[PDB]
Amino acid sequence: KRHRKVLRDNIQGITKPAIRRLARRGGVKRISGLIYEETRGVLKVFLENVIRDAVTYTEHAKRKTVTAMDVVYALKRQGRTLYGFGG
Amino acid sequence: NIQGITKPAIRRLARRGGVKRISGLIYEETRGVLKVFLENVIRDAVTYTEHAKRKTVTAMDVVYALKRQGRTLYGFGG
Amino acid sequence: AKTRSSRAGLQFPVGRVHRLLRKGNYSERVGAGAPVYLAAVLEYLTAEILELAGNAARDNKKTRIIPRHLQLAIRNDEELNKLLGRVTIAQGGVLPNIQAVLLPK
Amino acid sequence: TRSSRAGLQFPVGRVHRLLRKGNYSERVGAGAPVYLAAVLEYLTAEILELAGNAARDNKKTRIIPRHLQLAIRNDEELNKLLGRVTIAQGGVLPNIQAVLLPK
Amino acid sequence: RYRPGTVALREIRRYQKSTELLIRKLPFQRLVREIAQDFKTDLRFQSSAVMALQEACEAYLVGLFEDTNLCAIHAKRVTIMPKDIQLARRIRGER
Amino acid sequence: RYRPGTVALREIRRYQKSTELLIRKLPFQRLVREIAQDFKTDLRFQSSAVMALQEACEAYLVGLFEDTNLCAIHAKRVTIMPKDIQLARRIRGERA
Amino acid sequence: RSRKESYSVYVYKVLKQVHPDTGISSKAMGIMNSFVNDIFERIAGEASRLAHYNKRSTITSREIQTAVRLLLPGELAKHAVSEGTKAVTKYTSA
Amino acid sequence: RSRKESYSVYVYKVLKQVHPDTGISSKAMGIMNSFVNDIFERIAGEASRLAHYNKRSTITSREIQTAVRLLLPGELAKHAVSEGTKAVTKYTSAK
DNA sequence: ATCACCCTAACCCTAACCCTAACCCTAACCCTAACCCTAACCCTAACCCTAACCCTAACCCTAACCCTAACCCTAACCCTAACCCTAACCCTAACCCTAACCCTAACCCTAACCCTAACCCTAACCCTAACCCTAACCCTAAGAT
DNA sequence: ATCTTAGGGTTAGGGTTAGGGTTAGGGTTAGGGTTAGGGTTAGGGTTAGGGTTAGGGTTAGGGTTAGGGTTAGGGTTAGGGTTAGGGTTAGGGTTAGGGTTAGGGTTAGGGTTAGGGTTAGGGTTAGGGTTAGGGTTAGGGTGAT
Ligand SMILES: [Mn+2]
Ligand SMILES: [Mn+2]
Ligand SMILES: [Mn+2]
Ligand SMILES: [Mn+2]
């Protein structure tokens, strides 16, 4: 009823072992140590660009809840068309 | 006529792209890649011409085909 | 045959496709055979996908096609991959492939 | 004219007709062609501005497609906006890699 | 004690041959709400919308790893470096 | 007599700072009509349609050269090789 | 509440024709539904443009067919243009 | 023959406002005409989709608004959304 | 560096041709008008998202030895760069032929719209079979003796 | 190259979750009557294409020279693989509550429907500035004493 806890530095929640797993799926054998930060940078950019458009859809719909459709329409705008979450 | 796109004409296009050294195998690979590009564009351009029931491929058909290919061209009345 | 789909030998809904073409703002009018042609093209493509997916499901000893089977069918076909090249199948994973230089000597 | 009513050069009446003719929606709001003609007029002015500057730099008075390309690719936003667009007769921005420079 | 390569090659097969997500759902949901907060406050996210974002991200990053790895192999290497991620993004038109 | 890779640097500036086409109009028009005949016969081409195709081609190839050169430099080189054109078109989403 | 449209009835019908023993996940059916919708608007939108370009007010099966020839790959388009012209031909008779 | 529409009258008017001592090539005017047409379609089409997603049957300046925010880069969109809301505001005042 | 070597930009010459100023009339936009419905408002339902408790063992993080991929010099090799001069061929400059595009005139027939109509198909419910999970199971191949 | 050892691949039936069969029901597709405007014939204007002539001269092309880039191979550190253990929070199924989306009822103004009125801008013509093209020049590095 009264407060929202401060959200801060959650790009570190995308751990080095979680980044390692995504490299394995891409067929990566050796992973430099500098990569874990560069990946965090690139992931943050991707998320900003998608969520920014998703929210622009939510705001246009006069809603406070970002729906699965908004994220889908945003992905299609970015040319990263997603199958499975409606539409 | 793919050989009409000479080795010196290919070298000029490499210079605009900021290319210093050009391998000898490149001149043939470029000819391959250019042929693929032309096939894909003209194929769609003609599909537009044929839909319009025409025998002459217009500048607009080439423009519409380029836009379909994601190589949108400005200046040809599009 | 009372439904338009039965008159055309289709499973896909000819009546629904005709309604979506008008209700989707594509043109002023919708021809009589356009929803018929389109429902058939969509029905053909879904059958072409379902075919290769059921095959990937049978290879994996499964009865039911899950999104992995759909991804395996898409990326293993040359045309389906080109058609859905800039598309992401959720829960699809990747095709198993390891580059030759990364292999033990 | 509706363009004079909105303080515009771009045709508010024409844009309104193209919106219903182009099959975008059943109805077209009163302020939509006004907003759009203004956005198109703003962007043309933003381009023409940087293009006239590039023409001024090259000692010319008349902006040719080279001046338009130079204006587009030298901006960060105009380049991102027209990233998958080709200006005919535009040529490239002069740029040579640092490693391909004399030792 | 396995040699350097043997566990990496086992992991690649383990994950390529699988479809489960590789980032934990909660740290990712925090990151999403943090980023969204910085565009508009008082925002709610459908459970599905977050999963749609997570699927999108991982699929992107794995595909980015694919191109990155091809860039390391191009420069006679086996290990992915920032210069490779940068070249893969430069050529992809992300710059 | 100029050193190896000095006339090359002069040529790069000569062409980058220019906009004229780099393929002759007739050999190109022959290639276009040859390719088009292999899709449909009895075809006419508007003068403008051919130029629209030529502009499109060169602009594409120059941009391809840009990425190709970046690939040669990535693998500690100065000369563009087929492996570079292939890596450029592969990551561009033209080749697998 | 609101009603949610779907192509699940037809994806099921078509699945039984091809693999009568094979079943389908709820997620996989979502992927199939997204596929049908994506291709519907890809073809419809391309046909919408062809009509506009040729100053035509109607989308006829002739616009659907050239949209298919433009959008689908070589041998998929051939078989789709076939399967399509057949359904139209059959529809005109009955 | 037929009638050929064009935005040349307005590209000239607007050029005269920013650079009165500056002219324009016949080819450059074609490039400007292609630019106006491309951006017209880009915005109109995006607004057509927004109208549709929200089960609405009308493209209003609110749909043009959000299409501009989605399509135009960061500062360009800020200034376009400004000049757009400006022109609408002014239009409402004068009948 | 210091010396000659090329070349391309810098000015000022005069000419080709296209901007852009011009006129006129066409067709497009604009202010009369009724007229219907989409969107706005207001409600409440009702889900659903948020945050709240609970425990845990999955999964992370941190540092430890060192295996080996990365990157250094250098040396061998020839790939292609520069320079040239014979020569093919692309290029304007120029003409007519007439197939192909498209004007717009009559007239038919397709796709729209309408209400009542029945029939699919959405959804809400229910069981049983696919598949999920963890118990050991041998096979296999990693990598020291 | 033999021999131990830890990997996934496998089997088992436990056992849960899920899909597909099932009901009835709510809305959408189909029916068949009238409607008008896109489109389709028709002829027949006419634009614009390809055809085929010609004269250099710009440019392509083979074959001269050495230059230094690519490549190889060996040796050098040191960087990221792999092991273990102690946290360390992610993930599980809970629990409630109201901010939020939204059915569904009601009214009104926005927008389209019409046309006939002015008015903007397409289509043309044409004189004259801006670019073009050719020369000799200062300007600035290139390659080698
Ligand atoms: Mn914040
Ligand atoms: Mn009828
Ligand atoms: Mn290290
Ligand atoms: Mn409440």
PDB file of C-alpha atoms (C1' of nucleotides) in Angstrom, chain B residues 21-23 27 54-56, chain I residues 79-82 100-102:
ATOM      1  CA  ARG B  21      44.700  -4.526 -51.375  1.00  0.00           C
ATOM      2  CA  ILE B  22      42.444  -6.594 -53.711  1.00  0.00           C
ATOM      3  CA  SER B  23      43.001 -10.387 -54.109  1.00  0.00           C
ATOM      4  CA  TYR B  27      37.293 -10.265 -59.106  1.00  0.00           C
ATOM      5  CA  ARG B  54       3.074  -4.934 -69.355  1.00  0.00           C
ATOM      6  CA  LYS B  55       6.017  -5.920 -71.626  1.00  0.00           C
ATOM      7  CA  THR B  56       8.200  -2.938 -70.476  1.00  0.00           C
TER       8      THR B  56
ATOM      9  C1'  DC I  79      51.185 -12.440 -54.561  1.00  0.00           C
ATOM     10  C1'  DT I  80      49.546  -8.823 -56.761  1.00  0.00           C
ATOM     11  C1'  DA I  81      51.026  -3.427 -57.173  1.00  0.00           C
ATOM     12  C1'  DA I  82      52.886  -0.173 -60.417  1.00  0.00           C
ATOM     13  C1'  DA I 100       3.380  -1.013 -76.532  1.00  0.00           C
ATOM     14  C1'  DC I 101       1.106   1.659 -73.355  1.00  0.00           C
ATOM     15  C1'  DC I 102      -3.059   3.782 -72.047  1.00  0.00           C
TER      16       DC I 102
END
